[model samples]
Target: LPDLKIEKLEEGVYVHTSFEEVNGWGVVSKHGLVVLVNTDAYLIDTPFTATDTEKLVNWFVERGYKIKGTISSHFHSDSTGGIEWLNSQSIPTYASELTNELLKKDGKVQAKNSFSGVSYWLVKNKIEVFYPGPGHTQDNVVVWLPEKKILFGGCFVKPDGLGNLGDANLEAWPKSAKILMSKYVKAKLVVSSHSEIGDASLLKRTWEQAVKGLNESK
Candidate 1:
């Protein structure tokens, strides 16, 4: 009876957060994810549990957020854990082509569509998926909404632009992040996979933090 609540971020944008078991990372952690509904509906990553994934799919349909497709933030469970459930529902899933091999080796859920370059879709609200750089994972990518100026930084950066650096290619992170920042110079709301949402400034804050870590590693 304790179904998770779907949070409204703004207008048609919503957030569905849940606690997850990250065996290789946090032992267990709670992660926040996203969904969008307009003429089309989608999930960024599926919910943390099979139960929640089903509920979230229903949650959107109940309110008109149709499950047309979803994309993974990375190969990690926190990002693509709900994949099997999504497939069961006949929903198409998308992700970086790199994520395919990475998650496959990890024995995680697989996506239906794959691409190495930026991929996009829309329901009036445009969603673009791209490979930013190497942070979180070699295949970790981000989602950007040009109309909303909202960017889902995925695990590439930390919460609100500051925190621990996860399983990233440290030397390559800054380079990827640089590409991310340059692309979204006009971004307004940027969402992190683990923390509070902030504006475009968060990207640089994240970049700077990585720079500090790089220097410390020296």
Candidate 2:
């Protein structure tokens, strides 16, 4: 049986890959995210469901940490999938205003903490959440922990080898990549949603690939 697996990316961060079945595609893929902080963690995105989130939350709680809250990178389920369950656990949730609107439109629960135009919290925890315009989705954003030099590029940023755009804004994706490259210049560790992790060059390479994809129609 597929289970939640954890990998340490840096001193105080871990990438927890949750096994998810895309039954329509007849396959199981891993959706990943980082839980940042030494002990008390500030979660960045979630697993597939409430049940899974429960298991993950328990994992941390058992290890002696309090989950402060969750920061959603976008409105998609893979990004905000555990928000619903996290809320029931009395954990606060955050996201871009555009993300909340999209969630509401789809009759899904919306994040309580909404912000506009590149906002962030957690100063010492070394976390920064900002919008890099449109990429994977109109509301997509990236998380950067400068202390660790790890950039959570989320679903918007593609990774090495597999350059699939899924449901991204192919045209606007180039702009998103440009802003990310500029915004987080200090970033060394880059993590993607569905692929392997790499460095800053991987981010730039993905940008070039977005260019190629955009021009594919031409």
TM-score per candidate, chains pooled: 0.87, 0.91
| Per-residue lDDT over 53-162 for candidate 1, one digit per residue giving the tens place of the 0 to 100 score | 78877877886556788888888777887888888778888877789888888888678888767555533447788787777678888887777788887777673443
Clash pairs, model 1 backbone: none
What tens digits encode model 2's per-residue C-alpha lDDT throughout 13-91?
Answer: 8887877766565545555555656676777888777777788788878888888878888888877788888888788
Whole-model lDDT, candidate 1? 0.73
RMSD of each: 2.9, 2.0
| lDDT: worst 10-residue window of model 1 | 25-34
Could you tell me how far off, in angstroms, the CA of residue 203 lies in candidate 2 after the best superposition? 1.1
Query: What pairs collide in candidate 2?
Result: none
